[PDB]
Design an enzyme around this catalytic site. Structure first.
Site, PDB file in Angstrom:
ATOM      1  N   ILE A 148       0.792  -1.268   0.000  1.00 47.01           N
ATOM      2  CA  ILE A 148       0.000   0.000   0.000  1.00 47.01           C
ATOM      3  C   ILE A 148       0.819   1.312   0.000  1.00 47.01           C
ATOM      4  CG2 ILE A 148      -1.825   1.341   1.196  1.00 47.01           C
ATOM      5  CD1 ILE A 148      -3.056  -1.201   2.112  1.00 47.01           C
ATOM      6  N   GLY A 149       2.065   1.298   0.470  1.00 45.30           N
ATOM      7  CA  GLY A 149       2.891   2.511   0.464  1.00 45.30           C
ATOM      8  C   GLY A 149       3.839   2.553   1.632  1.00 45.30           C
ATOM      9  N   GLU A 150       4.629   3.624   1.701  1.00 51.10           N
ATOM     10  CA  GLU A 150       5.678   3.770   2.716  1.00 51.10           C
ATOM     11  C   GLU A 150       5.847   5.245   3.050  1.00 51.10           C
ATOM     12  OE1 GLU A 150       9.276   2.225   0.873  1.00 51.10           O
ATOM     13  OE2 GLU A 150       8.242   0.389   0.219  1.00 51.10           O
ATOM     14  N   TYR A 190       8.162   6.134   8.184  1.00 50.61           N
ATOM     15  CA  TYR A 190       9.117   5.157   8.699  1.00 50.61           C
ATOM     16  C   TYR A 190       8.481   3.766   8.728  1.00 50.61           C
ATOM     17  CZ  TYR A 190       6.919   6.193  13.332  1.00 50.61           C
ATOM     18  OH  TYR A 190       6.039   6.382  14.373  1.00 50.61           O
ATOM     19  N   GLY A 191       8.745   2.998   7.669  1.00 49.33           N
ATOM     20  CA  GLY A 191       8.211   1.655   7.500  1.00 49.33           C
ATOM     21  C   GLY A 191       7.124   1.539   6.448  1.00 49.33           C
ATOM     22  N   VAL A 222       3.548  -0.134   4.610  1.00 49.85           N
ATOM     23  CA  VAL A 222       2.151  -0.479   4.932  1.00 49.85           C
ATOM     24  C   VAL A 222       1.591  -1.526   3.972  1.00 49.85           C
ATOM     25  CG1 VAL A 222      -0.116   0.440   5.595  1.00 49.85           C
ATOM     26  CG2 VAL A 222       1.905   1.938   5.635  1.00 49.85           C
ATOM     27  N   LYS A 271       1.151  -1.800   9.611  1.00 51.31           N
ATOM     28  CA  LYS A 271       2.345  -0.989   9.437  1.00 51.31           C
ATOM     29  C   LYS A 271       3.530  -1.715  10.075  1.00 51.31           C
ATOM     30  CE  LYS A 271       0.767   2.587  11.700  1.00 51.31           C
ATOM     31  NZ  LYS A 271       0.292   3.877  12.275  1.00 51.31           N
ATOM     32  N   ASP A 305      -0.661  17.922  15.176  1.00 54.38           N
ATOM     33  CA  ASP A 305      -0.398  17.806  13.743  1.00 54.38           C
ATOM     34  C   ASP A 305      -1.607  17.433  12.917  1.00 54.38           C
ATOM     35  OD1 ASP A 305       1.392  17.962  11.534  1.00 54.38           O
ATOM     36  OD2 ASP A 305       1.926  15.867  11.774  1.00 54.38           O
TER      37      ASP A 305
END
Length: 347
Positions: free
Chosen positions: A22-24, A27-28, A30, A45, A140
């Site tokens: 699915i993506g990154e 940090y790490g 998914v 994750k 955030d």
């Protein structure tokens, strides 16, 4: 016949099958997967944080908060997978509910109806009421930290920069460095605040509401000071009363050095917007933090009256507190604490 892996090593054991990349992000990596015990799909994750003390700190902070919170509009942790011993622990896998998109991706492609804007804002504030009742600040908030499913349920994620509110220690100097996303930073951050009060989150929600109205960021500063000049361009020069609250001399004199600007009215920026939405926007995007509206007042605003129901808007059972302080600890003690926090999910 051994460990599974797409692209690299992603061993998540008996329970979780049928992975897809699915993506990154930060940090790490998914991946989605099939939770066999509950027969749903989930997000996993992989976090590999032990090699840098900054990632260790954000990881623990987040794990502690999410484990104690229990709310429909805040992402949960369903499971955590790590090695059985501290010496074998190199990775941690965090299991959460799968959410199809986020608000950042959605706003790149879709325009939102007024009913969708209202309902999304309701869910943000309902979640935020709970967070603030436990004396926690997110710090955030932005469209990519607001996750959505296909039925439009909204959940707040990413508590990596969260803190316990501490208004007595909020003051700092002019141009003090800040770690959160520049476009959603309150004006007091560049002037005299470390961001340790509830009013910084309300500012960010304000920014998000404007972004939902127009599909573009309202204060897109290219650098630290340009952020402040975008804000003053719309809100106009602060008044004497607001200036007199700023005791910090460097900040005050910077503000006095600028040429006068008049407020741009909101209906000029957003001519298609509902009138009540603009009145709420105005109370959220108030220059002075002490006059900025609080979460409970925002929920009770007319714009949200078809949803407002205080008996269905829970507060936390008790205030949240970090016993011991994570900013002054080495990566080896942090590893050991992550180990201890994650024990309850071990068979």
């Amino acid at each position: 016949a051994a460990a599974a892996g797409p692209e690299q090593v992603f061993d998540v054991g008996p329970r979780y099958t049928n992975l897809s990349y699915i993506g990154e992000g930060a940090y790490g990596m998914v991946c989605s997967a099939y939770d066999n015990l509950n027969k749903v799909r989930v997000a996993i994750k992989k976090i590999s944080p032990f090699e840098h003390q900054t990632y260790c700190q954000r990881t623990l902070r987040e794990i502690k908060i999410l484990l104690r919170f229990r709310h429909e509009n805040i992402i949960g942790i369903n499971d955590i997978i790590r090695a059985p011993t501290i010496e074998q622990m190199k990775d941690v896998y965090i299991v959460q509910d799968l959410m199809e998109t986020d608000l950042y991706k959605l706003l790149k492609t879709q325009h939102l109806s007024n009913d969708h804007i209202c309902y999304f804002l309701y869910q943000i504030l309902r979640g935020l009421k709970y967070i603030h009742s436990a004396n926690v600040l997110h710090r955030d908030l932005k469209p990519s930290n607001l996750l959505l499913n296909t039925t439009c349920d909204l959940k707040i994620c990413d508590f990596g920069l969260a803190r316990v509110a501490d208004p007595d220690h909020d003051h700092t100097g002019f141009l003090t460095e800040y770690v959160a996303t520049r476009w959603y930073r309150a004006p007091e951050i560049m002037l005299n605040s470390k961001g340790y009060t509830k009013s910084i989150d309300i500012w960010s929600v304000g920014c998000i509401l404007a972004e939902m109205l127009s599909n573009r960021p309202i204060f897109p500063g290219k650098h630290y000071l340009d952020q402040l000049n975008h804000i003053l361009g719309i809100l106009g020069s602060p008044s004497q009363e607001d200036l007199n609250c700023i005791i910090n001399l460097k900040a005050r004199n910077y503000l006095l050095s600028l040429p006068h600007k008049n407020k741009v009215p909101w209906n000029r920026l957003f001519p298609n917007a509902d009138s009540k939405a603009l009145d709420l926007l105005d109370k959220m995007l108030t220059f002075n933090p002490h006059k900025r509206i609080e979460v409970e007042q925002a929920l009770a605003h007319p714009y949200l009256e078809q949803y407002y129901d205080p008996s269905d808007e829970p507060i936390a059972e008790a205030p949240f507190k970090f016993d011991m302080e994570l900013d002054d600890l080495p990566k080896e003690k942090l590893k050991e604490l992550i180990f201890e926090e994650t024990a309850r999910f071990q068979p």
